[PDB]
């Protein structure tokens, strides 16, 4: 879904 897209980026900017 589109409403989860923003969450993906949030796990992405949560760095390694």
């Amino acid at each position, epitope marked *: 879904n*589109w*409403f989860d*897209i*923003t969450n993906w980026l*949030w796990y992405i*900017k*949560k760095k390694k």
Partner: antibody
Amino acid sequence: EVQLVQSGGEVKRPGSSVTVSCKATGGTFSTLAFNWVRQAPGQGPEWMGGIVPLFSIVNYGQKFQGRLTIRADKSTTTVFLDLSGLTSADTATYYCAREGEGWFGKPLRAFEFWGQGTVITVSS
Amino acid sequence: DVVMTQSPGTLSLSPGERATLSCRASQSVSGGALAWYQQKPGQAPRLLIYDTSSRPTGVPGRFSGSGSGTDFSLTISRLEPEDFAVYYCQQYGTSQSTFGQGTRLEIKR
């Protein structure tokens, strides 16, 4: 506090196109979803579409495709709503609603922050 | 697509009484992505419950949401005078989100 301030209400001729703007302040803008929701007199809210400004990812309701455009300006944290081919069925209050933020970030998806609404009357 | 139907159309109850509003989806909502909103006359809706059961900050604890599928009950344990309003449910588990038709919670007399 996160605040969304919309443009003023307007009357539009039938068949024309209306643009509504939503100025977003308060906090993070670019990495969250902004949605447009409208409500006709005496009716319930209807979701129209949304934007993630970061890469201008859009999602349009099926019933509005061909007539609806959603845009977003990261330089001014403003999201836009464009609706063409107006008819009396589009007379409504239009709301710009942002998904919530929970603890250290996370998108909540649910629409936590709302603009004051823009009253659009399609008539003659 | 998924249709959201709320019940009853109008719910008439007494201040201080317990309230339960039902919302049913025409197909199962994935991952409980269901929110409840409150709307008073002239104001935008206000989010009361998201992700089936999670309550945003600022919403009083007398509000709770449950479901686990297609039947989401918003419960208000103790109807305060300010709680009489129209309530909407919304599913957002798919890429096309939709709202229910509303339940009007009004004062009984």
